[PDB]
Amino acid sequence: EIVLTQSPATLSLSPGERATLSCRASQSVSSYLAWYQQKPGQAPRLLIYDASNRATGIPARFSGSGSGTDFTLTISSLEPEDFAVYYCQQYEFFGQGTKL
Amino acid sequence: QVQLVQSGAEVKKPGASVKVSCKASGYTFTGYYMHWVRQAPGQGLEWMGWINPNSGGTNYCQKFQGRVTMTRDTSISTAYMELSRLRSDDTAVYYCARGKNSDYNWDFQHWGQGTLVTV
Amino acid sequence: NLWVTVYYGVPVWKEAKTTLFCASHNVWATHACVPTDPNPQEVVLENVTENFNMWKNDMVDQMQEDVISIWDQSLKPCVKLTPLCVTLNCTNVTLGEIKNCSFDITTEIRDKTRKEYALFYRLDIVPLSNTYRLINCNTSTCTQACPKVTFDPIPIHYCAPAGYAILKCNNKTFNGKGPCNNVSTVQCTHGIKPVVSTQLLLNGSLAEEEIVIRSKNLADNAKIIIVQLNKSVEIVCTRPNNNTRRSIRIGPGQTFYATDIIGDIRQAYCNISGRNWSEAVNQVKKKLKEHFPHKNISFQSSSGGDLEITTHSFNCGGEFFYCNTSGLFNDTISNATIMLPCRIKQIINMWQEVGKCIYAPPIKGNITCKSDITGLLLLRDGCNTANNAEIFRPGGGDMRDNWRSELYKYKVVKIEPLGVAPTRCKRRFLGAAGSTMGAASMTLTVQARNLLSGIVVWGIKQLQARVLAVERYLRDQQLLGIWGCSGKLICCTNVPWNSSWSNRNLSEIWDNMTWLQWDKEISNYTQIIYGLLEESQNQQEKNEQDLLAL
Amino acid sequence: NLWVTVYYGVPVWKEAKTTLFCASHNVWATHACVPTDPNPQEVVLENVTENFNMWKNDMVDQMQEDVISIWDQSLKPCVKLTPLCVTLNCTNVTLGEIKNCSFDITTEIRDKTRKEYALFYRLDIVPLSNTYRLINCNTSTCTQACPKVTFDPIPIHYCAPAGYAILKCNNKTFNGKGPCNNVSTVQCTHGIKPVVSTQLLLNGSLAEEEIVIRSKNLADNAKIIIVQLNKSVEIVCTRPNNNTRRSIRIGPGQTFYATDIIGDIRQAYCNISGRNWSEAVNQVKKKLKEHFPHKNISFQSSSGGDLEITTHSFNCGGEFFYCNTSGLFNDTISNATIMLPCRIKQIINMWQEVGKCIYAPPIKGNITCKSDITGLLLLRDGCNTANNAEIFRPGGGDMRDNWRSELYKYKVVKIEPLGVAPTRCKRRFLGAAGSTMGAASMTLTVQARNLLSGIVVWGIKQLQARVLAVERYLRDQQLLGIWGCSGKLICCTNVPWNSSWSNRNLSEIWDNMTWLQWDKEISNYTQIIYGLLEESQNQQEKNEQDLLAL
Ligand SMILES: *[C@@H]1O[C@H](CO)[C@@H](O[C@@H]2O[C@H](CO)[C@@H](O[C@@H]3O[C@H](CO[C@H]4O[C@H](CO)[C@@H](O)[C@H](O[C@H]5O[C@H](CO)[C@@H](O)[C@H](O)[C@@H]5O)[C@@H]4O)[C@@H](O)[C@H](O[C@H]4O[C@H](CO)[C@@H](O)[C@H](O)[C@@H]4O[C@H]4O[C@H](CO)[C@@H](O)[C@H](O)[C@@H]4O)[C@@H]3O)[C@H](O)[C@H]2NC(C)=O)[C@H](O)[C@H]1NC(C)=O
Ligand SMILES: *[C@@H]1O[C@H](CO)[C@@H](O[C@@H]2O[C@H](CO)[C@@H](O[C@@H]3O[C@H](CO[C@H]4O[C@H](CO)[C@@H](O)[C@H](O[C@H]5O[C@H](CO)[C@@H](O)[C@H](O)[C@@H]5O)[C@@H]4O)[C@@H](O)[C@H](O[C@H]4O[C@H](CO)[C@@H](O)[C@H](O)[C@@H]4O[C@H]4O[C@H](CO)[C@@H](O)[C@H](O)[C@@H]4O)[C@@H]3O)[C@H](O)[C@H]2NC(C)=O)[C@H](O)[C@H]1NC(C)=O
Ligand SMILES: *[C@@H]1O[C@H](CO)[C@@H](O[C@@H]2O[C@H](CO)[C@@H](O[C@@H]3O[C@H](CO[C@H]4O[C@H](CO)[C@@H](O)[C@H](O[C@H]5O[C@H](CO)[C@@H](O)[C@H](O)[C@@H]5O)[C@@H]4O)[C@@H](O)[C@H](O[C@H]4O[C@H](CO)[C@@H](O)[C@H](O)[C@@H]4O)[C@@H]3O)[C@H](O)[C@H]2NC(C)=O)[C@H](O)[C@H]1NC(C)=O
Ligand SMILES: *[C@@H]1O[C@H](CO)[C@@H](O[C@@H]2O[C@H](CO)[C@@H](O[C@@H]3O[C@H](CO[C@H]4O[C@H](CO)[C@@H](O)[C@H](O[C@H]5O[C@H](CO)[C@@H](O)[C@H](O)[C@@H]5O)[C@@H]4O)[C@@H](O)[C@H](O[C@H]4O[C@H](CO)[C@@H](O)[C@H](O)[C@@H]4O)[C@@H]3O)[C@H](O)[C@H]2NC(C)=O)[C@H](O)[C@H]1NC(C)=O
Ligand SMILES: *[C@@H]1O[C@H](CO)[C@@H](O[C@@H]2O[C@H](CO)[C@@H](O)[C@H](O)[C@H]2NC(C)=O)[C@H](O)[C@H]1NC(C)=O
Ligand SMILES: *[C@@H]1O[C@H](CO)[C@@H](O[C@@H]2O[C@H](CO)[C@@H](O)[C@H](O)[C@H]2NC(C)=O)[C@H](O)[C@H]1NC(C)=O
Ligand SMILES: *[C@@H]1O[C@H](CO)[C@@H](O[C@@H]2O[C@H](CO)[C@@H](O)[C@H](O)[C@H]2NC(C)=O)[C@H](O)[C@H]1NC(C)=O
Ligand SMILES: *[C@@H]1O[C@H](CO)[C@@H](O[C@@H]2O[C@H](CO)[C@@H](O)[C@H](O)[C@H]2NC(C)=O)[C@H](O)[C@H]1NC(C)=O
Ligand SMILES: *[C@@H]1O[C@H](CO)[C@@H](O[C@@H]2O[C@H](CO)[C@@H](O)[C@H](O)[C@H]2NC(C)=O)[C@H](O)[C@H]1NC(C)=O
Ligand SMILES: *[C@@H]1O[C@H](CO)[C@@H](O[C@@H]2O[C@H](CO)[C@@H](O)[C@H](O)[C@H]2NC(C)=O)[C@H](O)[C@H]1NC(C)=O
Ligand SMILES: *[C@@H]1O[C@H](CO)[C@@H](O[C@@H]2O[C@H](CO)[C@@H](O)[C@H](O)[C@H]2NC(C)=O)[C@H](O)[C@H]1NC(C)=O
Ligand SMILES: *[C@@H]1O[C@H](CO)[C@@H](O)[C@H](O)[C@H]1NC(C)=O
Ligand SMILES: *[C@@H]1O[C@H](CO)[C@@H](O)[C@H](O)[C@H]1NC(C)=O
Ligand SMILES: *[C@@H]1O[C@H](CO)[C@@H](O)[C@H](O)[C@H]1NC(C)=O
Ligand SMILES: *[C@@H]1O[C@H](CO)[C@@H](O)[C@H](O)[C@H]1NC(C)=O
Ligand SMILES: *[C@@H]1O[C@H](CO)[C@@H](O)[C@H](O)[C@H]1NC(C)=O
Ligand SMILES: *[C@@H]1O[C@H](CO)[C@@H](O)[C@H](O)[C@H]1NC(C)=O
Ligand SMILES: *[C@@H]1O[C@H](CO)[C@@H](O)[C@H](O)[C@H]1NC(C)=O
Ligand SMILES: *[C@@H]1O[C@H](CO)[C@@H](O)[C@H](O)[C@H]1NC(C)=O
């Protein structure tokens, strides 16, 4: 099966900064990944897919990359609005996600 | 635009069953698979299964096999999910979701508001 | 130094999206199809390794459209069961699957009505406390299949138009996705039977080497897994009943065929040898294990869905029916022949088209069908259990996957006969693909001569194809004419070779490289060269006029 | 010695099965037909003796399909008399052939009905003790001929597509089967009228030399005998009644036309001069005697059958009717004009198509038709009497025999412009058919130039024909190109003549034989030669490259 692990679990970051979120799997899945943003009381929203493509309405500053079993989400020019939970997903398998 | 409209929150007693609806609009109902996933109250998300409105075909997560069932009614573009033998640990927000592309349908771009179900 | 030389009839091609035509009062093998070619020419393209992808093969979608288009047209002139939608007063004939219903029928004279009765299956009846209606009356008008048609899945051969070719992957263990070191070219496909079925694929093709399991992506639990068997399994289905037909006049030259029963009633069923199935299952599980090396394998019944999915659907050459296959998709199997119960429908919704409906007339006497299971469609449960076991279930419904299970060996490409290469000079079927550029030049006629008229609801397609072939042919001939290379196969020009176009050794080009490899490198400057060639002839024409004026 | 030489544009042909196109809001002369060619070019092929067979001429079957296809399409948008099928309460107007019927009609508003009446002929009414129904209500729905159409048999000219030619047998006494020493070629047929009739053939073509009697086999009493007259016989038919029309609204923009009568009623009839007919009969009997040299000849009435056969059926440009011709098919004939009684139908079943039906609207005022009898259809009684007399009777019904009686002079063939002959060398319209191979070579351009675009429900046929012509043209041009004979009419090659191909004297070949005769002998090795020619060019191409490389 596929088990996704992300880190750091939590990140205390300031506006204007840059940070990245890792994601690993025990099996190679090429690039079939997705990243979701999750806010309190809100529905999940697609941020990145194919580990390269931005979802609709997502600012350029949101990106990411990876291959095989090692992937990472990259967000530049961090805003207060980014202080949410982000999940790594592969097929039906959901990771634990991290909070900014 | 497109949207998914789910029923309101519900409270049942342990051992009972719950039925949750999801109405779709803005697109061809039978165009895409409908997925169900529940968000645990302070934990990650757990995928339940999906249904294909074209034939009512389903695929359930093994761990819920025999507990959960899904169906649909195309005449009203509405999907239905039902969970029997409810337990206290089943408390969660059940989301109605649809993928972006018919090819890779795991890209859940479109979501409903989520339905909170407890015991 | 090197100069530009034009070659016509070179063995190269590219993926293309075109229309194929049908080669044979059958519902599918219509009068509009052409006679087949009894001698296919499987030319082996040694040293050619083409890559195939059954999951993106347009031939499948084209097939789907073909089958439907024919079906609809075939039933166009058939009786529309409009007046049938009346109040139904029904009673009983515990196999209470058949109800005796009476109703008011309008006679030939609009002013007159009378009583009439017919036997219908419960599955086709909807409660409206003993009054019912036909299930379709709130969706659409079902068309009664014309009394003189044939639904026998007569195999259809697909043929390419001139300028195009069909490649075959002859690698018996090909997964349907990737390189095919064993490749040949044909003019037409073999005869593929338009078998409409779910779950278990009947009367299909068998594997030539071994059982093969293929899928678009095994990691994607939303996709269907297709397994093709080498050893067939016999299955016999029968409907042991006196389904005597009755002719009811429902309009001015419109006869409705009702069912009647002379004797008693017995449920339809299928007979499949247990031992046979068990062996087949064990073999399949083994092959699956290879892909899932550290887990158990379990076969279960359908998780649920429409009857068409939960049960095994097929046309028994007569009345359509559905069988319960829970006795096969199991881990506990007996040696003894397994009997599978079935139910019969008179009102059938073809494919997944909403608003489409047909009514099947009763067949007098009993029916028995002997068929072979050649493969089946399975899907895997999502998630993973601590029990380290994977569960597979029957599925289907999208006929495209049935067609995909047969057409996976074929690929359609277009031939690009015009090529350019460097030579040391100055002016003044398809087997050659595996040959070097030099040697391949000795077969330019063999290829070129077959790029024009190799061909000598389907009508319009054939006509369109004919025109397209002409357009392409003339286009190329026009260019050769303009460049002053008319009628030639190898035409040396007056345009010098550029250094930026290639840095390959002349010897390697002609003695080692093939035309396919060359194309992939030199295509970069296709238009550049063409432009220069046109200018050259213009210069020559004015020079000739200058001389003539003297 | 002798070498292979290729000739393009040689005057030879073979039987072919192709599609001809129509050259002119008429029911038959539709908008889809082309303008006619006012100047046919009857090129006489002297010394050419072609063999014709009217009994196997596909043109006839093609004609039949054409006529029907048009008819059906023309009536497609016309009102369907569905709601007419109601209870009919009828009374009388002893010529009681017309009944006054009342019925319940549904008005524009579905919720409202009213009383209405119309006059119908007994022949169109079926008893259902004074209640009736329309005859068609248990077969199909009759379509009312649109109120603005024309059924006048406007002559249609058939024209061949490029690459094909139509041959005419101009032998005035030709039996329709065998050699025609007098033969010419045309681009189109003359205008043939689509006259639908039985027994007596009206408004047809007359014999040019004498009365001619022809049949597939006189020994076969199951076949029809066709006789064509040289001298026409005038016949005038009339319907002397006030058939005033009434417009009845039967739906939302659907008007039914009913018959009404203002004055009194008189039966329709035909007027044919007795003396005239008698003479014609005597002449025909004489010609028959020639075939049956020691027997008497008697003309009797139809043995029986449907009205359409027993009586003389024809369209009088208006309402269809049938006449009793027992007064003509007789041995006792008076000099005085013979009056033949007739009956009129409103509901007509066209041809012999079951389920096909049309309703004819009434024509206000009386109708009179003046027409000529040009020929007739007779059959002979089987067996033989000791009285040594043969009996002939009127017949018909299959319109194909009507068309066959006009198209018997035409034959369709395809031209095969490519020919090969032995010559002493080494490389480096259709009037010529009657000429020797040598002389015929002087007209290659005249012929070849007209094998491409000579042309400059019918739409699709014209389009298909255009494409076919192109395909054939290009095919031949491609071959000439490949063989290195592009642009030439007479191309000497580099392939030596074989001894096994011919043992004829060179002089005889060019000075005595014609291309047609040559083809029949040399065709044996058509493919053999073609193969060699292709190889030759391949050799030349590589030799040129070798030289160029120097
Ligand atoms: C996977 O493939 C297998 C085959 O590879 C398919 O199985 C085949 O399915 C077809 C279709 O049902 C079967 O053909 C049908 O068999 C019927 C039974 O015939 C027997 O009984 C009659 C009763 O008197 C006998 O006359 C027959 O004998 C004759 O035929 C056999 C055949 O080989 C000859 O050997 C004999 O010498 C005789 O000639 C048999 O004993 C049969 O009735 C049926 O015939 C009707 O339908 C065909 C359609 O093509 C018509 O051509 C034919 O004229 C009949 O139709 C007329 O009559 C009916 C009667 O009411 C009318 O309704 C029609 O409008 C029309 O007038 C046909 O022959 C075939 O036998 C069977 N083969 C096997 C091995 O099972 C599987 O179905 C297929 N799987 C799937 C899912 O499709
Ligand atoms: C074998 O061949 C012979 C001929 O070679 C055929 O016989 C011919 O059949 C046609 C068809 O029936 C005859 O034409 C029709 O004749 C009708 C009678 O016309 C006379 O009376 C009217 C009354 O006022 C006069 O106006 C006419 O005078 C005009 O026409 C003559 C014709 O030469 C001129 O010379 C005059 O100067 C005038 O111009 C005559 O005296 C006639 O009514 C009818 O016309 C209708 O149909 C035609 C169809 O082509 C329409 O074009 C035309 O507009 C009329 O149709 C309109 O009006 C009606 C009235 O209700 C509407 O219902 C229509 O919808 C439309 O509005 C037509 O002209 C022809 O005369 C006749 N010839 C002979 C010599 O018999 C045989 O039938 C044929 N055999 C078979 C078996 O077919
Ligand atoms: C055109 O006509 C067709 C006719 O079939 C319409 O389709 C029908 O629509 C109605 C509308 O809802 C459907 O009713 C619902 O059916 C579901 C499921 O029941 C069916 O499927 C079960 C499969 O697990 C099967 O077991 C059922 O059979 C049992 O029950 C019947 C009922 O009496 C009995 O006769 C049998 O012997 C069996 O005992 C049955 O096949 C059902 O769950 C729905 O009820 C739920 O939802 C309502 C809504 O609030 C709620 O009140 C209930 O408490 C419950 O929660 C409901 O009955 C019907 O099933 C459809 N037909 C089919 C074959 O599915 C179609 O909609 C019409 N078109 C239009 C435009 O209207
Ligand atoms: C659709 O509707 C049409 C309506 O016409 C149906 O066609 C009719 O079918 C019936 C069914 O059998 C036919 O009845 C038979 O008719 C024959 C011959 O009679 C007709 O032809 C004679 C020509 O020689 C003609 O003289 C007759 O006219 C006389 O008789 C009538 C009758 O009352 C009278 O009204 C006239 O004034 C004349 O006096 C008539 O036109 C007849 O011989 C048959 O009887 C024999 O067979 C029966 C069967 O056992 C037997 O019992 C009798 O003793 C006898 O042996 C029988 O009457 C009818 O003729 C058909 N119509 C026509 C025009 O032919 C059509 O079938 C319907 N379709 C469907 C699917 O039902
Ligand atoms: C069909 O293919 C399967 C593929 O597994 C063949 O299975 C073979 O069975 C024998 C005996 O059980 C084994 O020893 C082989 O190793 C199996 N094949 C493989 C690749 O492992 C099966 O025999 C084939 N059947 C036929 C008729 O060819
Ligand atoms: C599917 O397999 C299960 C077992 O894996 C079958 O259950 C057995 O059924 C037989 C009789 O029907 C019983 O005697 C056994 O005791 C059952 N097994 C158990 C563990 O209870 C089941 O019947 C199979 N389904 C079908 C349709 O055959
Ligand atoms: C496919 O590749 C093989 C290997 O190079 C080719 O075989 C050679 O062909 C040349 C042609 O004259 C011979 O001189 C070599 O000796 C051959 N080598 C061997 C090992 O046989 C083969 O011809 C290639 N296929 C084609 C169509 O050219
Ligand atoms: C037209 O064709 C007929 C035959 O269809 C020719 O009839 C021939 O007449 C001569 C005269 O003596 C006979 O010897 C032949 O036997 C007849 N032929 C047949 C088949 O009987 C007639 O001569 C031809 N007319 C023309 C001008 O060619
Ligand atoms: C039409 O053809 C017939 C053919 O028989 C001609 O009949 C001729 O009649 C005269 C006088 O009765 C005879 O002496 C001739 O011998 C007959 N011909 C033959 C071949 O015997 C009839 O005259 C022709 N009519 C016209 C107007 O040409
Ligand atoms: C068909 O011919 C026969 C004679 O061959 C006609 O019978 C004659 O009819 C007239 C009056 O109608 C009688 O005066 C004669 O006596 C009849 N002849 C005999 C021998 O009785 C018969 O009428 C003719 N048919 C038609 C319709 O005219
Ligand atoms: C049809 O045959 C006649 C008879 O042979 C041909 O007439 C001869 O033509 C040649 C051509 O130069 C002349 O030299 C002969 O003197 C002609 N003979 C007679 C008797 O006139 C006639 O040319 C042939 N038809 C065609 C088209 O060639
Ligand atoms: C697979 O099934 C066999 C059957 O005995 C069992 O021994 C093995 O442990 C199973 N595999 C796993 C991973 O449980
Ligand atoms: C058939 O019987 C044999 C007897 O040893 C048994 O091993 C085998 O599993 C049985 N197979 C089925 C499918 O019942
Ligand atoms: C062609 O030759 C010219 C000669 O100077 C060179 O500049 C050019 O880059 C070459 N390639 C092309 C594509 O023109
Ligand atoms: C030229 O060749 C390069 C090789 O990768 C290719 O990417 C580029 O698109 C080519 N340009 C043209 C015009 O074909
Ligand atoms: C033919 O009819 C004539 C008429 O008088 C008769 O003399 C002659 O004998 C008849 N022929 C035969 C063979 O009876
Ligand atoms: C016409 O009258 C003449 C008078 O002699 C007679 O010979 C001839 O047979 C008669 N013809 C008809 C058809 O009555
Ligand atoms: C052609 O010439 C060769 C020369 O020997 C001869 O054998 C052959 O039979 C001739 N005919 C054909 C058809 O090849
Ligand atoms: C060769 O000529 C003979 C002559 O009768 C013919 O029968 C045979 O079919 C011809 N062969 C070919 C190939 O045309």
mmCIF file with all atom_site columns, all heavy atoms in Angstrom, chain D residues 362-373, unseen atoms left out:
data_model
loop_
_atom_site.group_PDB
_atom_site.id
_atom_site.type_symbol
_atom_site.label_atom_id
_atom_site.label_alt_id
_atom_site.label_comp_id
_atom_site.label_asym_id
_atom_site.label_entity_id
_atom_site.label_seq_id
_atom_site.pdbx_PDB_ins_code
_atom_site.Cartn_x
_atom_site.Cartn_y
_atom_site.Cartn_z
_atom_site.occupancy
_atom_site.B_iso_or_equiv
_atom_site.pdbx_formal_charge
_atom_site.auth_seq_id
_atom_site.auth_comp_id
_atom_site.auth_asym_id
_atom_site.auth_atom_id
_atom_site.pdbx_PDB_model_num
ATOM 1  N N   . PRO D 1 362 ? -59.217 14.972 -55.678 1.00 0.00 ? 362 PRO D N   1
ATOM 2  C CA  . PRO D 1 362 ? -60.127 15.194 -56.776 1.00 0.00 ? 362 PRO D CA  1
ATOM 3  C C   . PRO D 1 362 ? -59.689 16.364 -57.622 1.00 0.00 ? 362 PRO D C   1
ATOM 4  O O   . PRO D 1 362 ? -59.155 17.346 -57.107 1.00 0.00 ? 362 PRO D O   1
ATOM 5  C CB  . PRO D 1 362 ? -61.445 15.483 -56.063 1.00 0.00 ? 362 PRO D CB  1
ATOM 6  C CG  . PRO D 1 362 ? -61.029 16.011 -54.699 1.00 0.00 ? 362 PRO D CG  1
ATOM 7  C CD  . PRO D 1 362 ? -59.742 15.283 -54.371 1.00 0.00 ? 362 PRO D CD  1
ATOM 8  N N   . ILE D 1 363 ? -59.954 16.278 -58.914 1.00 0.00 ? 363 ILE D N   1
ATOM 9  C CA  . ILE D 1 363 ? -59.668 17.380 -59.817 1.00 0.00 ? 363 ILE D CA  1
ATOM 10 C C   . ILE D 1 363 ? -60.953 18.055 -60.264 1.00 0.00 ? 363 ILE D C   1
ATOM 11 O O   . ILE D 1 363 ? -61.791 17.436 -60.914 1.00 0.00 ? 363 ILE D O   1
ATOM 12 C CB  . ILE D 1 363 ? -58.887 16.891 -61.042 1.00 0.00 ? 363 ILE D CB  1
ATOM 13 N N   . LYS D 1 364 ? -61.107 19.323 -59.901 1.00 0.00 ? 364 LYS D N   1
ATOM 14 C CA  . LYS D 1 364 ? -62.312 20.073 -60.238 1.00 0.00 ? 364 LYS D CA  1
ATOM 15 C C   . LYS D 1 364 ? -62.482 20.190 -61.749 1.00 0.00 ? 364 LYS D C   1
ATOM 16 O O   . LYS D 1 364 ? -61.543 20.548 -62.461 1.00 0.00 ? 364 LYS D O   1
ATOM 17 C CB  . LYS D 1 364 ? -62.274 21.454 -59.591 1.00 0.00 ? 364 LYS D CB  1
ATOM 18 N N   . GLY D 1 365 ? -63.683 19.885 -62.232 1.00 0.00 ? 365 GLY D N   1
ATOM 19 C CA  . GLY D 1 365 ? -63.964 19.895 -63.664 1.00 0.00 ? 365 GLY D CA  1
ATOM 20 C C   . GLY D 1 365 ? -63.696 18.521 -64.254 1.00 0.00 ? 365 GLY D C   1
ATOM 21 O O   . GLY D 1 365 ? -63.260 17.616 -63.549 1.00 0.00 ? 365 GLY D O   1
ATOM 22 N N   . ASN D 1 366 ? -63.969 18.359 -65.541 1.00 0.00 ? 366 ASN D N   1
ATOM 23 C CA  . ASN D 1 366 ? -63.767 17.062 -66.181 1.00 0.00 ? 366 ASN D CA  1
ATOM 24 C C   . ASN D 1 366 ? -62.360 16.936 -66.741 1.00 0.00 ? 366 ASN D C   1
ATOM 25 O O   . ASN D 1 366 ? -61.649 17.929 -66.896 1.00 0.00 ? 366 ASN D O   1
ATOM 26 C CB  . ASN D 1 366 ? -64.796 16.841 -67.270 1.00 0.00 ? 366 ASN D CB  1
ATOM 27 C CG  . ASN D 1 366 ? -64.615 17.761 -68.438 1.00 0.00 ? 366 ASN D CG  1
ATOM 28 O OD1 . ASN D 1 366 ? -63.598 17.695 -69.139 1.00 0.00 ? 366 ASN D OD1 1
ATOM 29 N ND2 . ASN D 1 366 ? -65.578 18.623 -68.663 1.00 0.00 ? 366 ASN D ND2 1
ATOM 30 N N   . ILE D 1 367 ? -61.961 15.706 -67.046 1.00 0.00 ? 367 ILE D N   1
ATOM 31 C CA  . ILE D 1 367 ? -60.650 15.436 -67.628 1.00 0.00 ? 367 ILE D CA  1
ATOM 32 C C   . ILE D 1 367 ? -60.747 14.619 -68.907 1.00 0.00 ? 367 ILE D C   1
ATOM 33 O O   . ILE D 1 367 ? -61.494 13.644 -68.977 1.00 0.00 ? 367 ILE D O   1
ATOM 34 C CB  . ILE D 1 367 ? -59.737 14.695 -66.629 1.00 0.00 ? 367 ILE D CB  1
ATOM 35 N N   . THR D 1 368 ? -59.964 15.005 -69.907 1.00 0.00 ? 368 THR D N   1
ATOM 36 C CA  . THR D 1 368 ? -59.854 14.238 -71.139 1.00 0.00 ? 368 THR D CA  1
ATOM 37 C C   . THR D 1 368 ? -58.399 14.085 -71.552 1.00 0.00 ? 368 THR D C   1
ATOM 38 O O   . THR D 1 368 ? -57.662 15.065 -71.641 1.00 0.00 ? 368 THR D O   1
ATOM 39 C CB  . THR D 1 368 ? -60.655 14.897 -72.267 1.00 0.00 ? 368 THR D CB  1
ATOM 40 N N   . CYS D 1 369 ? -57.989 12.847 -71.804 1.00 0.00 ? 369 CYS D N   1
ATOM 41 C CA  . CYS D 1 369 ? -56.620 12.562 -72.209 1.00 0.00 ? 369 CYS D CA  1
ATOM 42 C C   . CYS D 1 369 ? -56.559 11.942 -73.592 1.00 0.00 ? 369 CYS D C   1
ATOM 43 O O   . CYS D 1 369 ? -57.156 10.894 -73.842 1.00 0.00 ? 369 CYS D O   1
ATOM 44 C CB  . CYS D 1 369 ? -55.944 11.605 -71.222 1.00 0.00 ? 369 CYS D CB  1
ATOM 45 S SG  . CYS D 1 369 ? -55.714 12.273 -69.569 1.00 0.00 ? 369 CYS D SG  1
ATOM 46 N N   . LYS D 1 370 ? -55.801 12.567 -74.476 1.00 0.00 ? 370 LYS D N   1
ATOM 47 C CA  . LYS D 1 370 ? -55.557 12.017 -75.798 1.00 0.00 ? 370 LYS D CA  1
ATOM 48 C C   . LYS D 1 370 ? -54.165 11.421 -75.853 1.00 0.00 ? 370 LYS D C   1
ATOM 49 O O   . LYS D 1 370 ? -53.175 12.125 -75.669 1.00 0.00 ? 370 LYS D O   1
ATOM 50 C CB  . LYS D 1 370 ? -55.720 13.096 -76.867 1.00 0.00 ? 370 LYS D CB  1
ATOM 51 N N   . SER D 1 371 ? -54.086 10.119 -76.084 1.00 0.00 ? 371 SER D N   1
ATOM 52 C CA  . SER D 1 371 ? -52.803 9.436  -76.062 1.00 0.00 ? 371 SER D CA  1
ATOM 53 C C   . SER D 1 371 ? -52.697 8.411  -77.170 1.00 0.00 ? 371 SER D C   1
ATOM 54 O O   . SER D 1 371 ? -53.698 8.003  -77.756 1.00 0.00 ? 371 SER D O   1
ATOM 55 C CB  . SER D 1 371 ? -52.606 8.751  -74.730 1.00 0.00 ? 371 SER D CB  1
ATOM 56 N N   . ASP D 1 372 ? -51.475 7.992  -77.449 1.00 0.00 ? 372 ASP D N   1
ATOM 57 C CA  . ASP D 1 372 ? -51.230 6.995  -78.472 1.00 0.00 ? 372 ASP D CA  1
ATOM 58 C C   . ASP D 1 372 ? -50.778 5.677  -77.888 1.00 0.00 ? 372 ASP D C   1
ATOM 59 O O   . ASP D 1 372 ? -49.912 5.636  -77.013 1.00 0.00 ? 372 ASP D O   1
ATOM 60 C CB  . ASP D 1 372 ? -50.176 7.494  -79.452 1.00 0.00 ? 372 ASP D CB  1
ATOM 61 N N   . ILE D 1 373 ? -51.317 4.594  -78.424 1.00 0.00 ? 373 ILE D N   1
ATOM 62 C CA  . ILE D 1 373 ? -50.827 3.268  -78.098 1.00 0.00 ? 373 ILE D CA  1
ATOM 63 C C   . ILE D 1 373 ? -49.629 2.964  -78.963 1.00 0.00 ? 373 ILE D C   1
ATOM 64 O O   . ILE D 1 373 ? -49.711 3.019  -80.189 1.00 0.00 ? 373 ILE D O   1
ATOM 65 C CB  . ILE D 1 373 ? -51.909 2.200  -78.308 1.00 0.00 ? 373 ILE D CB  1
#
